[PDB]
Design a protein around this nucleic acid. Structure first.
Ligand SMILES: [Mg+2]
Ligand SMILES: [Mg+2]
Ligand SMILES: [Mg+2]
Ligand SMILES: [Mg+2]
Ligand SMILES: [Mg+2]
Ligand SMILES: [Mg+2]
Ligand SMILES: [Mg+2]
Ligand SMILES: [Mg+2]
Ligand SMILES: [Mg+2]
Ligand SMILES: [Mg+2]
Ligand SMILES: [Mg+2]
Ligand SMILES: [Mg+2]
Ligand SMILES: [Mg+2]
Ligand SMILES: [Mg+2]
Ligand SMILES: [Mg+2]
Ligand SMILES: [Mg+2]
Ligand SMILES: [Mg+2]
Ligand SMILES: [Mg+2]
Ligand SMILES: [Mg+2]
Ligand SMILES: [Mg+2]
Ligand SMILES: [Mg+2]
Ligand SMILES: [Mg+2]
Ligand SMILES: [Mg+2]
Ligand SMILES: [Mg+2]
Ligand SMILES: [Mg+2]
Ligand SMILES: [Mg+2]
Ligand SMILES: [Mg+2]
Ligand SMILES: [Mg+2]
Ligand SMILES: [Mg+2]
Ligand SMILES: [Mg+2]
Ligand SMILES: [Mg+2]
Ligand SMILES: [Mn+2]
Ligand SMILES: [Mn+2]
Ligand SMILES: [Mn+2]
Ligand SMILES: [Mn+2]
Ligand SMILES: [Mn+2]
Ligand SMILES: [Mn+2]
Ligand SMILES: [Mn+2]
Ligand SMILES: [Mn+2]
Ligand SMILES: [Mn+2]
Ligand SMILES: [Mn+2]
Ligand SMILES: [Mn+2]
Ligand SMILES: [Mn+2]
Ligand SMILES: [Mn+2]
Ligand SMILES: [Mn+2]
Ligand SMILES: [Mn+2]
Ligand SMILES: [Mn+2]
Ligand SMILES: [Mn+2]
Ligand SMILES: [Mn+2]
Ligand SMILES: [Mn+2]
Ligand SMILES: [Mn+2]
Ligand SMILES: [Mn+2]
Ligand SMILES: [Mn+2]
Ligand SMILES: [Mn+2]
Ligand SMILES: [Mn+2]
Ligand SMILES: [Mn+2]
Ligand SMILES: [Mn+2]
Ligand SMILES: [Mn+2]
Ligand SMILES: [Mn+2]
Ligand SMILES: [Mn+2]
Ligand SMILES: [Mn+2]
Ligand SMILES: [Mn+2]
Ligand SMILES: [Mn+2]
Ligand SMILES: [Mn+2]
Ligand SMILES: [Mn+2]
Ligand SMILES: [Mn+2]
Ligand SMILES: [Mn+2]
Ligand SMILES: [Mn+2]
Ligand SMILES: [Mn+2]
Ligand SMILES: [Mn+2]
Ligand SMILES: [Mn+2]
Ligand SMILES: [Mn+2]
Ligand SMILES: [Mn+2]
Ligand SMILES: [Mn+2]
Ligand SMILES: [Mn+2]
Ligand SMILES: [Mn+2]
Ligand SMILES: [Mn+2]
Ligand SMILES: [Mn+2]
Ligand SMILES: [Mn+2]
Ligand SMILES: [Mn+2]
Ligand SMILES: [Mn+2]
Ligand SMILES: [Mn+2]
Ligand SMILES: [Mn+2]
Ligand SMILES: [Mn+2]
Ligand SMILES: [Mn+2]
Ligand SMILES: [Mn+2]
Ligand SMILES: [Mn+2]
Ligand SMILES: [Mn+2]
Ligand SMILES: [Mn+2]
Ligand SMILES: [Mn+2]
Ligand SMILES: [Mn+2]
Ligand SMILES: [Mn+2]
Ligand SMILES: [Mn+2]
Ligand SMILES: [Mn+2]
Ligand SMILES: [Mn+2]
Ligand SMILES: [Mn+2]
Ligand SMILES: [Mn+2]
Ligand SMILES: [Mn+2]
Ligand SMILES: [Mn+2]
Ligand SMILES: [Mn+2]
Ligand SMILES: [Mn+2]
Ligand SMILES: [Mn+2]
Ligand SMILES: [Mn+2]
Ligand SMILES: [Mn+2]
Ligand SMILES: [Mn+2]
Ligand SMILES: [Mn+2]
Ligand SMILES: [Mn+2]
Ligand SMILES: [Mn+2]
Ligand SMILES: [Mn+2]
Ligand SMILES: [Mn+2]
Ligand SMILES: [Mn+2]
Ligand SMILES: [Mn+2]
Ligand SMILES: [Mn+2]
Ligand SMILES: [Mn+2]
Ligand SMILES: [Mn+2]
Ligand SMILES: [Mn+2]
Ligand SMILES: [Mn+2]
Ligand SMILES: [Mn+2]
Ligand SMILES: [Mn+2]
Ligand SMILES: [Mn+2]
Ligand SMILES: [Mn+2]
Ligand SMILES: [Mn+2]
Ligand SMILES: [Mn+2]
Ligand SMILES: [Mn+2]
Ligand SMILES: [Mn+2]
Ligand SMILES: [Mn+2]
Ligand SMILES: [Mn+2]
Ligand SMILES: [Mn+2]
Ligand SMILES: [Mn+2]
Ligand SMILES: [Mn+2]
Ligand SMILES: [Mn+2]
Ligand SMILES: [Mn+2]
Ligand SMILES: [Mn+2]
Ligand SMILES: [Mn+2]
Ligand SMILES: [Mn+2]
Ligand SMILES: [Mn+2]
Ligand SMILES: [Mn+2]
Ligand SMILES: [Mn+2]
Ligand SMILES: [Mn+2]
Ligand SMILES: [Mn+2]
Ligand SMILES: [Mn+2]
Ligand SMILES: [Mn+2]
Ligand SMILES: [Mn+2]
Ligand SMILES: [Mn+2]
Lengths: 271, 44
RNA sequence: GAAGGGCCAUCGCUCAACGGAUAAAAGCUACCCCGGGGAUAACAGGCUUAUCUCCCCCAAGAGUUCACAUCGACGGGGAGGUUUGGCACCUCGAUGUCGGCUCAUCGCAUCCUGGGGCUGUAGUCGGUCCCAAGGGUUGGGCUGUUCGCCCAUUAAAGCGGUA
RNA sequence: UGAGUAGCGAAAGACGGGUGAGAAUCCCGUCCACCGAUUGACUAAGGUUUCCAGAGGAAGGCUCGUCCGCUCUGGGUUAGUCGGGUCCUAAGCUGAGGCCGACAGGCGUAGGCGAUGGAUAACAGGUUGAUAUUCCUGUACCACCUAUAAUCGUAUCGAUGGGGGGACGCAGUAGGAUAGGCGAGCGUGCGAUUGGAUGCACGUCUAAGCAGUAAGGCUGAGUAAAAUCCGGUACUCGGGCUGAGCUGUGAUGGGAGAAGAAGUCGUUGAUUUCACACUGCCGAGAAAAGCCUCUAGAUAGAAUAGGUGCCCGUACCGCAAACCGACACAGGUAGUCAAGAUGAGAAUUCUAAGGUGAGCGAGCGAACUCUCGUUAAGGAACUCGGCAAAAUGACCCCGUAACUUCGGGAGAAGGGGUGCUCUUUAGGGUUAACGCCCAGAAGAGCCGCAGUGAAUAGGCCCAAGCGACUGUUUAUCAAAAACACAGGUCUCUGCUAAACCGUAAGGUGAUGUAUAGGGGCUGACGCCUGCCCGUGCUGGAAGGUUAAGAGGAGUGGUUAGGCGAAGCUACGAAUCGAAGCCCCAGUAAACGGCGGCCCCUAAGGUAGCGAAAUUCCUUGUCGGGUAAGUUCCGACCCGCACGAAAGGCGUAACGAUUUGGGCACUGUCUCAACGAGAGACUCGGUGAAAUCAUAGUACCUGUGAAGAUGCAGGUUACCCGCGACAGGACGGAAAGACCCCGUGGAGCUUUACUGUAGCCUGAUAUUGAAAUUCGGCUUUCUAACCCGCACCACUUAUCGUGGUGGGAGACAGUGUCAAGCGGGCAGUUUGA
RNA sequence: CUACCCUUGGUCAGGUUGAAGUUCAGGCUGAAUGGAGGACCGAACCGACUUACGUUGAAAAGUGAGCGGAUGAACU
């Protein structure tokens, strides 16, 4: 991590990431980038759930999320960065000669022709379903359904070692600490992902946060009663009612939001 | 000072035009009652 | 036939805000709004004068002696209308509000100056009463302050009325 | 009526000559002044005839009018190549079918429409009273067509289809050119004010098409994602491809100056223009066509001189008298060009180009008000408060404190210099070492009161409170101590995620996936964050308590034959009956907690601060500063009533913050004075308004609805203006905003009442097969049902619709009914 | 008009400070290079702190003089 010296205030404790691993290729591949128009509000135009908006133009680099190829080997030619995915990606160069975008797991190498198929090399890399693979192996991009390409683990760090296996659907631990039985025979990429240093980033300057999608968020204790349960009161004032609350009523420092009579109830125990 | 109303031909004939009028049921309701009134000016 | 009514007898109310609005009912508004009232408050005026300020009557006492130089307990009688009030009589289709600045004007229960009686007045100073309203009656520190304390002067650093 | 009153909307005009019935005001003229990073030039938005000419003067023009953006008559806008359409797409809009829906209609796949962006073929000159890259003189390109072929053959054209371009952010450095700038052959002229033979202007030539161009970026042949010789991908073999500012040539005659009836040089400076080029940074920077290609499929054959090329806009205003502001309105309005001197500059002053003298004037030189200038001695004494004003100011040089997060504080504070001339001679660049630039260093003089001689350009220091900071806010009485902020922590959320829009579909979140995303609270950073389990939340459920529904004992009415069977009928508890609630625990960066002597609730304030933005008594006590200090600062502690995420205590830096103290300054003040201008004032023109029961409208003591121009009784006063001042007319303006009242309104709150959107749970249809304890509890399987996943088709489409394979499966989902939660939302009550 | 917002464009004379990195001399200091920043001074531009004037205004929120920001949470 870069640690900026206070040339000035607000820069007083910035910690932009030490982008040493960004290494190969700043530009990133032209084939993989379409338009990425941004919006803070839902259709109808009304501002559905948004304490955010604004911010710089983003690429829309396309992840090859499925890892859907079989038996081919690929170069992993470049380590080029991605904004929206938080963790920077790597660019696999497939043997067919078409190239594809992988998320980039910790370990990392300029060249390793790993994975992409049912044949199972359990040594980092990708591929390999749930029916295969050893108990306790660390794994990145997990699937929620067969064929859907996976979506469970991702982000800037990643984990969820294959905590045991049994039945028609092998069990796994997750980064939240929930232990869920995801269905067996679904692809699960090997290894932890990305910047273990990412959580340590400190924005420092106000509005570098506004360079991102973030924009300022006014508290409930201020404002006026027509605008919020916490609103009103001459002078600075406490919460008032028992149980602190969100706008739109509804208590917000205790009650569990999980849906009743969910389909997901059969899978998983604890969290 | 800046005042209310800064004129715009396109913006005026959008929103207020005969086309935008007939585009909606209510715009038709409007044209209906203006013709019932006998307006010469109808709906520019 | 019955279900239901009527009539006669009676029971079910701190319906107690007790002639009992409903079987069933608390608060905030200085973000405020409309209809009204001088029928009704806050300012000033007016009436009043408990309070207030001033003035007396009586004279136990104080003052070595002597009530009445000076001071005056308990009680008693009044004046003034500057205070806090009481009353709600003018004003709610508006009678602008503290202090300061500016400009003043009047009363006398006189702070200074002028004239006097008494003195527990030797003299130079004083104290207290009497006549007297012509003129005079300071700059600063602090506080929005009026008040008030202080610094330094001065013949003196007056008290009130005038929305 | 007020009243011939207020006003006539920011400026410099003078004269002569015209015109005319009539000129301060129209036209011509000379001089003058004003703008000149703009009051100039050009254009988009908007305006639509205001544009031009000749006439006119009623009304409009804040005066005048012979004049006009006014009236009449007449007339004005010319494109193959400029902007736009016959090209392209973004946000967004529309959306065949389709998914949803009381109706109306909402959403949305195609696909369309859509510039503010992408591609797009000409330029210089001349000319009119109004147009010109549009007319015409010259020179030129683009596309098409028709006429020839040197060169092919069941070469040429290649797609709605892939590929490659197009194709991109921000900052910074140089460097290459180019415009423009500045000085010394070219036309003219040579001074009557003492002097001199130098005085003034200009010094250019377009696209197109020939030539090159080091500033820029990059290596070549064999083979193998649905149809490919192109793309991609990998093994062998040591300087030219793509762009390109600009220059040279040709275009070559056109442009040109003074006037008296033909000119193109050289030198020097040099960008804001010519590159997202290069370099660096992270917050990782649109699309689609035109263009180059390669296949699938098409097709007999593809330099020269004639021709063909459409619709729309084009006038004029455009920082303005033509646009938005009711006005010919001191305001608002995107972009482009933008010269000299001086300068760091687009700052400052004066000027170019070029524009204007602002649509009432003449006098006078009272008060008073405004805008300026000066001021003896004093220097904050003024004041709520140094409000206002004065002071500081540029460059070169020295010299700079506590503190500190080591960056800062800092331009700290503060001291010296500055003009002109003449010598010497040492850096720079450009060049044939000439001169041209810019610009120092040392020495001697000269002048003034004063040398950044005008203009323009920081006052500063000490200490306190709040807030870390840059930032945000009440358009139009509050810019702050309020909001935000990075950081902290808490909670929820496993992914058709929560959480939000909507009845839904559909969609945000988010082409995101717990280092993420929603909500609460705090507010950099530093040192820390204590004590206590009714409400809430979370978990537990042994027992109590609870709805529809299941269940039927038994009850009553009728009559087949008082007793009274059936039948149909009203009505029915025992039992079974979920979530909640009662009880149990856990949780305080969840809501929220401080009694009494000379006794108790669940626990009774640790650290730190303290008479605070918190302290009533109170100007507390002591000390600091002052001659004097209700303020201020430092302590003290019986803290009326500080206190640890409504955070506690410090904190460098920062502040148009609140407060206290100084240096310097001064009309703030002692105490006011004079001067310039505008208005006021006299005259000519023009000519409003609020208000107004009729008025011939005195004072004093009194009276009275309890404060009188108008009543009583006195006192005083000839009739009529003008300039002034504000005591009064309970002066004008607003049916008082406080107060109260009305069985008024509205916004807001909650354990006020009654409800309701939604959410949780139960029975019951949808809703089937099969396995034991007596249909009920729990399990297994598929034909119902479900997919916000896989390949398949309709189909060059993530929508749907069918398929098939998976997954989940009688659960869910919806429907009817039921019971809880429910200021999220509604209607209201809240006495006299 | 105003508030956010999506798509696409445009504008910000000049002067100052000198972050990382790099480059040489020590067992993290001086020098050159370099060009960081809701950095400093100050026009355009955006804003409205104080004050005077204006109050039947030139103006139904302005004007003069100062004042804040001005490479950014910028202005439009
Ligand atoms: Mg930074
Ligand atoms: Mg916030
Ligand atoms: Mg509050
Ligand atoms: Mg009454
Ligand atoms: Mg009185
Ligand atoms: Mg007197
Ligand atoms: Mg005026
Ligand atoms: Mg004549
Ligand atoms: Mg065109
Ligand atoms: Mg046509
Ligand atoms: Mg659509
Ligand atoms: Mg229909
Ligand atoms: Mg013009
Ligand atoms: Mg005018
Ligand atoms: Mg003066
Ligand atoms: Mg103040
Ligand atoms: Mg000054
Ligand atoms: Mg310095
Ligand atoms: Mg302190
Ligand atoms: Mg204090
Ligand atoms: Mg979505
Ligand atoms: Mg404090
Ligand atoms: Mg106090
Ligand atoms: Mg507190
Ligand atoms: Mg503190
Ligand atoms: Mg005058
Ligand atoms: Mg005048
Ligand atoms: Mg008067
Ligand atoms: Mg009000
Ligand atoms: Mg109510
Ligand atoms: Mg500053
Ligand atoms: Mn950052
Ligand atoms: Mn508030
Ligand atoms: Mn509320
Ligand atoms: Mn509250
Ligand atoms: Mn409070
Ligand atoms: Mn009966
Ligand atoms: Mn009664
Ligand atoms: Mn009642
Ligand atoms: Mn308030
Ligand atoms: Mn009212
Ligand atoms: Mn009365
Ligand atoms: Mn009274
Ligand atoms: Mn009165
Ligand atoms: Mn009396
Ligand atoms: Mn008495
Ligand atoms: Mn009364
Ligand atoms: Mn009475
Ligand atoms: Mn009245
Ligand atoms: Mn009045
Ligand atoms: Mn007397
Ligand atoms: Mn006297
Ligand atoms: Mn007096
Ligand atoms: Mn007159
Ligand atoms: Mn006149
Ligand atoms: Mn008059
Ligand atoms: Mn007058
Ligand atoms: Mn006048
Ligand atoms: Mn004028
Ligand atoms: Mn005439
Ligand atoms: Mn002239
Ligand atoms: Mn000038
Ligand atoms: Mn137009
Ligand atoms: Mn004309
Ligand atoms: Mn006339
Ligand atoms: Mn006229
Ligand atoms: Mn032509
Ligand atoms: Mn349809
Ligand atoms: Mn365009
Ligand atoms: Mn274009
Ligand atoms: Mn013209
Ligand atoms: Mn031309
Ligand atoms: Mn920068
Ligand atoms: Mn010559
Ligand atoms: Mn001469
Ligand atoms: Mn001579
Ligand atoms: Mn034109
Ligand atoms: Mn104007
Ligand atoms: Mn503007
Ligand atoms: Mn402009
Ligand atoms: Mn210039
Ligand atoms: Mn210069
Ligand atoms: Mn200038
Ligand atoms: Mn000129
Ligand atoms: Mn005067
Ligand atoms: Mn006056
Ligand atoms: Mn005036
Ligand atoms: Mn001076
Ligand atoms: Mn003086
Ligand atoms: Mn002096
Ligand atoms: Mn002094
Ligand atoms: Mn002096
Ligand atoms: Mn003072
Ligand atoms: Mn004083
Ligand atoms: Mn104060
Ligand atoms: Mn000041
Ligand atoms: Mn200095
Ligand atoms: Mn000197
Ligand atoms: Mn001298
Ligand atoms: Mn702040
Ligand atoms: Mn600020
Ligand atoms: Mn604002
Ligand atoms: Mn305001
Ligand atoms: Mn949905
Ligand atoms: Mn807070
Ligand atoms: Mn039942
Ligand atoms: Mn029976
Ligand atoms: Mn706590
Ligand atoms: Mn406590
Ligand atoms: Mn003082
Ligand atoms: Mn003291
Ligand atoms: Mn203190
Ligand atoms: Mn707390
Ligand atoms: Mn705080
Ligand atoms: Mn002082
Ligand atoms: Mn004058
Ligand atoms: Mn009238
Ligand atoms: Mn009348
Ligand atoms: Mn008279
Ligand atoms: Mn009477
Ligand atoms: Mn009386
Ligand atoms: Mn009287
Ligand atoms: Mn009287
Ligand atoms: Mn008069
Ligand atoms: Mn009055
Ligand atoms: Mn009223
Ligand atoms: Mn009251
Ligand atoms: Mn009321
Ligand atoms: Mn509750
Ligand atoms: Mn069910
Ligand atoms: Mn399907
Ligand atoms: Mn219900
Ligand atoms: Mn309820
Ligand atoms: Mn309510
Ligand atoms: Mn009602
Ligand atoms: Mn009452
Ligand atoms: Mn610059
Ligand atoms: Mn800055
Ligand atoms: Mn202003
Ligand atoms: Mn303000
Ligand atoms: Mn200004
Ligand atoms: Mn400024
Ligand atoms: Mn600045
Ligand atoms: Mn923008």
């Amino acid at each position: 991590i870069k640690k900026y010296k206070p040339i000035t205030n607000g820069r007083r404790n910035m910690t932009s990431l030490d982008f040493a691993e960004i290494t190969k290729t700043t530009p990133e591949k032209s084939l993989l980038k379409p338009l990425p128009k941004k919006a803070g509000r839902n259709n109808q135009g009304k501002l559905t759930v948004r304490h955010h908006g604004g911010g710089h133009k983003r690429q829309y680099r396309v992840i090859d999320f499925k890892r859907n190829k079989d038996g081919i080997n690929a170069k992993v030619d470049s380590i080029q960065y991605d904004p929206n995915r938080s963790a920077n990606i790597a660019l696999v160069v497939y043997a067919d000669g078409e190239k594809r975008y992988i998320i980039a797991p910790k370990g990392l190498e300029v060249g390793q022709i790993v994975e992409s198929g049912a044949e199972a090399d359990i040594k980092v890399g990708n591929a390999l379903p749930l029916q295969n693979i050893p108990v306790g192996t660390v794994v990145h991009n997990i699937e929620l359904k067969p064929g859907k390409g996976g979506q469970i683990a991702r982000s800037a760090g990643a984990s969820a070692q294959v905590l045991g296996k049994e039945g028609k659907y092998v069990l796994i631990r997750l980064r939240s600490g929930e232990v869920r039985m995801i269905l067996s025979t679904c692809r699960a990429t090997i290894g932890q992902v990305g910047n273990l240093q990412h959580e340590l980033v400190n924005v420092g300057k106000a509005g570098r946060s506004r360079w991102k999608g973030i924009r300022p968020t006014v508290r409930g204790s201020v404002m006026n009663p027509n605008d919020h349960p916490h609103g009103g009161g001459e002078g600075r004032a406490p919460i008032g009612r028992p149980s602190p609350m969100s706008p739109w009523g509804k208590p917000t420092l205790g009650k569990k939001t999980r849906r009743g009579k969910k389909s997901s109830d059969k899978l998983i125990v604890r969290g | 000072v800046k005042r209310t109303y800064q004129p715009n031909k396109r913006k005026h004939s959008k929103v207020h035009g005969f086309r935008k009028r007939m585009s909606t049921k209510n715009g038709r309701k409007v044209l209906a009652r203006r013709r019932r009134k006998g307006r010469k000016v109808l709906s520019a």
